[PDB]
Structure 1
Amino acid sequence: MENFQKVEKIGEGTYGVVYKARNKLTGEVVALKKIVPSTAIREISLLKELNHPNIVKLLDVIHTENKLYLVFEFLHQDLKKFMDASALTGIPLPLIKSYLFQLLQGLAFCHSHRVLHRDLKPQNLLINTEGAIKLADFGLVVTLWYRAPEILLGCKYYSTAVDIWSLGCIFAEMVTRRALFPGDSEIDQLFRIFRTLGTPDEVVWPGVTSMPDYKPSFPKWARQDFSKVVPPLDEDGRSLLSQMLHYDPNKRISAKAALAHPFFQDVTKPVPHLRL
């Protein structure tokens, strides 16, 4: 950044690499994403207006020599690193609950403005020492682990429900300390989902057999109880998770509706123990 001084590489985005950087002037510390289509520019510039406490702020867009730099607010840690760091002990349920609640407020906000994330995963969830968690780097090797089934089945016009699916996968992962559906190919991803939730059919998902990539030859697996899926999550949490993982996107719980689920009756805001 002629106006920025690169400090260190903090991650590898899907679009490009992310650097922690210093505003050579203000001295402000930010995250710089190094990635142009005119449509891309208007689309991105629009995201500068989408501000919420649980969304990583897009500060500026710099298009130079056809190179595109996105300047974001900096957060000290991402959820993937925090999960790895919490592997031996696991993240306390009260914190998991607080994180889920905050992310649902973030999605509820975005979704109300008809903005989808599309690519939610632990590396895109950032936390600070105050106990906040925020959704970062909205879309517009990569992991398929968090991809909704409707996308895998070829639905072209998917909805905000895809984000609820991704977040449900992350919620389960925080609880059990293992990825829910770690597929290593599109078909492995789909079959992993089917093996746990049952192979979808017209009973549970009207219209599924008509989808572009649906094949009558898919193996038929029976659904497993969530008590096996996410022990030792309590009944309220299993119920909400089950609602976030509904096959039919039209039946999948909305972020707004999820915020009212009995699981959040005792929600609080603990502070994580972060070693920076």
Structure 2
Amino acid sequence: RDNNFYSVEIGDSTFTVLKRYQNLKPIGSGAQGIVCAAYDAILERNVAIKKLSRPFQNQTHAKRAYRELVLMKCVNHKNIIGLLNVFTPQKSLEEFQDVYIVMELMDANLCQVIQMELDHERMSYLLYQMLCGIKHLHSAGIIHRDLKPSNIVVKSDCTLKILDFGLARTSFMMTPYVVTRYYRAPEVILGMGYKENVDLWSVGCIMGEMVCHKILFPGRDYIDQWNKVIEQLGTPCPEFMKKLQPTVRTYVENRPKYAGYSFEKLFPDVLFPADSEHNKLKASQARDLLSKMLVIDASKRISVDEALQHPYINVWYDPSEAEAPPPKIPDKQLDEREHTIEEWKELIYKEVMDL
């Protein structure tokens, strides 16, 4: 029971885990906690274990932990990281501190894949899977808004899973950890409203980085971010500027003007396989897809369904993946809850125990 746990030091943290999980080794860490690889001696396979330390300690951590528990439980899709187990070593609501989330173990992070040249077959398949995951979230009313390579993982067989569920409908932390903002859409950067295709901008940024092996828009803050976007893509049209509130419009209209670059110049043939006629045609199609994702004005940007149907992508199309029954989310206030620390503590404990 309590004797069915053991503890090991993992860097500056203590992991206290069920004895079924053996041979822990750190594989990543972030604002939310440390993740280890482990061998599950019962399943006879390796797994990933994330430790959430006092996730109820503030509202930002708490909302994310609670929503991720609920979503991981109700979602079952091959391109979304799946839940294998959840436990706490503490034996009561009173003593509760930590949550451990056990997931499928993948082979690499997409940041490592970005450092490799990819053939069109692998590149298109990875993008196809991203799009299936995103569409599946959208089908349940979940718009991610913060898709990024660090939170996407892959196997050697080119299978891909998204690790997180995004920004909900909402962030200050005392932390040395820094939020990666490079993939966020113009309507996020400028504080505009958004719709489902906010996520397609991020897919564009990821695709473009897979192709050129550089972060497209590495801004140090949102002002820098916007400059980098307009330097490459060009100052947006007046029809876009008109959609901005005056405080933001005066700012956007008063930046120096940029012509931008064609997509042929941003993503030349030398960045793609382009020897054979097959590869030439695929390079053309890839560039066309990029040109439809990396569109500042969201009203003119590709949708998930148009991307799934695009010639570069549609060779993979399978409605069991792309038209799967939507997740059924049981907490109808999932994105709107406001709670005290003590309230979030009880809500999370109950999720963990199933209570």
TM-score under structure 1 normalisation?
Answer: 0.84
Deviations along 1:63-93, one digit per CA (max 9) or x if unpaired, are: 5523233322110111112232x2xxx1112
Partners of 1:202 and 1:208 within 8 A in 2? no
Q: Deviations over 1:214-235 (max 9, x none)?
A: 6143222122101111122533
Matched, 1:9 2:26: yes
Structure 1 segment 1-276 matched on structure 2, within 5 A: 1-3=16-18, 4-5=21-22, 7-23=24-40, 25-35=42-52, 36=56, 39-40=63-64, 42-47=66-71, 48-62=73-87, 65-84=96-115, 86=116, 90-140=117-167, 141-155=178-192, 157-204=193-240, 206-210=242-246, 215=251, 216-232=253-269, 234-264=283-313, 266=315
How far apart are residue 54 of structure 1 and its match? 1.3
Contact 1:111 1:160 in 2 (8 A): yes
Indicate how the Cα distance of structure 1 residues 106 and 265 shifts in structure 2: closer, same or farther if over 3 A, else same.
closer
CA separation of 1:106 and 1:214: change in aligned 2, threshold 3 A = farther
How far off its partner does 1:59 sit?
2.9
SS class of match (2:254): coil
Separation (CA, whole Å) in 2 of partners of 1:2 and 1:79 = 28
The question of whether the paired residues in 1 share the 8 Å contact of 2:79 and 2:161 is answered with yes
C-alpha distance after superposition, 1:78-114 (max 9, x if no partner): 1112232x2xxx1112211111112111111111111
Task: Say if 1:5 and 1:118 are closer, same or farther in 2 by CA, change over 3 A.
Answer: farther
189-198 vs 205-214, which moves further: 205-214
The 3 A distance-change label for structure 1 pair 251 and 82 is same
C-alpha contact 1:76 1:126 (8 A) present in aligned 2: yes
Listed one character per residue, the Cα deviations across residues 128-162 of structure 1 (whole Å, up to 9, x for unaligned) are 1222122112334222221111111123x533322
What is the distance in 2 between the residues matched to 1:74 and 1:123? 15
Native 8 Å contact 1:145 1:182 kept in 2: yes
Structure with the bigger RCO (C-alpha within 8 Å, sep 6+) is 2
Q: How many residues of Structure 1 are paired with residues of Structure 2 in the alignment? A: 263
Shift in CA distance, 260/26, structure 1 to aligned 2, threshold 3 Å? closer
Cα drift, residue 119 of structure 1? 2.2
SS at match of 2:49: strand
In the TM superposition, what whole-angstrom CA distance separates every residue of 1:10-69 from its partner, at most 9, and x where no partner exists?
112342222112346545422122231675555223212112111111334445523233
Q: Distance in 1 between matches of 2:242 and 2:83?
A: 39
Contact 1:153 1:211 in 2 (8 A): no
Determine helix, strand or coil for the equivalent of 1:43. Answer: helix
Report sequence identity in percent: 36
Say what the alpha-carbon RMSD is for the aligned residues: 2.6
Q: Is contact 1:94-1:267 (8 Å) kept?
A: no
Give the deviation of 1:197 after TM superposition.
1.2
Task: Give distance in 1, aligned partners of 2:103 and 2:248.
Answer: 37
The letter of the residue matching 2:28 is G
Distance in 1 (CA, whole Å) between partners of 2:138 and 2:263 is 27
Partner Cα separation in structure 1 for residue 183 and residue 309 of structure 2? 24
Residues 1:116 and 1:68: Cα distance change in structure 2 (over 3 Å): farther
Counterpart code for 2:97: N
Gaps of 5+ in 2: 1-15, 91-95, 168-177, 273-282, 318-355
For normalisation by structure 2, the TM-score amounts to 0.66
Residue identity matched to 1:230: F
Partners of 2:308 and 2:314 within 8 A in 1: no
Unaligned runs of 5+ in 1: 269-276
Give the drift of 1:199.
Answer: 2.0
Q: Distance in 1 between matches of 2:222 and 2:236?
A: 16
1:240 to 1:40, Cα distance in 2 relative to 1, 3 A: closer
**8 Å contact 2:127–2:313 — kept in the other structure?**
no
Q: Which deviates further from its counterpart, 36-45 or 105-114?
A: 36-45
Larger radius of gyration: 2
